[PDB]
Symmetry: C6
């Protein structure tokens, strides 16, 4: 197992994904600074398209609390509904 | 494990979430008053968007019975349907 | 575990819910009469919105056979479809 | 466990349900003739609304092969789609 | 257990179904030729309506590779979508 | 078990499929060059229709990172929505 191989599943909730990411990051043999930079880069890069969209909408400077609270809607009825309606409107 | 990390999954039923929340709260090392305040704040803050919407509509002064009885519709056929129709109407 | 904490899940089939309800009710320390009254009140009170709608439509005087046979449609394709269409008609 | 309590789940496939029905029926203490009559009556009576609709369309005189082969469409994409479209047409 | 009772589930993927079919066929006491004929007849006869539709569209002379590669779309988003749209067009 | 029998499930995420593909590929008795060629041909050939569509759109010269990052949208709300809308537009 490597930190680079941690990718969020398409139907995986964000909290689970970040949990696996941090579990694995606590194991990789690397300096703390490298672990922080890893956090900032990988954590956002390896999310699925929906969560990556929301986080891209948040911009920079957001904490984990803000991100996770922003993403726990994905897959919920309201999210699926809004996304579907927006998709039908686009096409 | 910490009480602050208990967040309701997007597809998780409310009863399960409150079950984990109270199971964990009985373990966190803190005074009884701090545990009650934790209940009031976290329990509502850490729910997913749908349940948070319904509970915000209930307002304050509601008991666990009133909240849970208010939220067990989420994910049910009627709930998903109503949410979908309202979403199509919005866009 | 207490009989008052037995609540039907949003996606839980009715037969399962009544199975848990009676399994738990056979354990609660209470007189037989109190257990019957418990049955009549809780069993209907703690169901989810869809089943509560159907049972409310049945009215009083219905047996468990009539109720369960009335509710095993919930979640089935026909049920979800009919409910969805009615929801679209409402909005 | 009793044969009268075997009911098909709303999302349960037919083959599984008949499997439970025959497994439990093989245990009930009763004469063989009573077990056959049980088969004919309960097996059709305790199915969910969709399968009961299809089997009601088949009528009497059908064997298990004809029924099961008639019902394995339930829940499949084609079934859910057709049912949904017919429901939209009704309303 | 008998080869005649192997039926594809409504939501079962084709690869799994053929896996059970061949696993069981390796157990049934019968000559190799009878097992081949069993393959040709049962394997296609006992599939669910969607897979039976696609395979019927393929016609005869197709190998297992062609069939399985033809059916792995069933249940996928694209399949369910196409089937749903065709269903709405039909009604 | 043989590498030729590794096929992506209809609802299986791509990362899982490639994980099984490489897990099995590390076991098949063959020279390394044959294993690379196996990778290039089978890995893309045995995917389901959606992933095969996206990867076919990518063309040649793409690495595993580009493919996997391209496919983790499959099954996500946005993907299913876009596919559904495009399907309704086609018909």
């Amino acid at each position: 197992t490597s930190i680079l191989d941690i990718r969020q599943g398409p139907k995986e909730p964000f909290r689970d994904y970040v949990d696996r990411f941090y579990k694995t990051l606590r194991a990789e043999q690397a300096s703390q600074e490298v672990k922080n930079w890893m956090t900032e880069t990988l954590l956002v890069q390896n999310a699925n398209p929906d969560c990556k969209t929301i986080l891209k909408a948040l911009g920079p400077g957001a904490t984990l609390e803000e991100m996770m609270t922003a993403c726990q809607g994905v897959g919920g009825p309201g999210h699926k509904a809004r996304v579907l309606a927006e998709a039908m409107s686009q096409v």
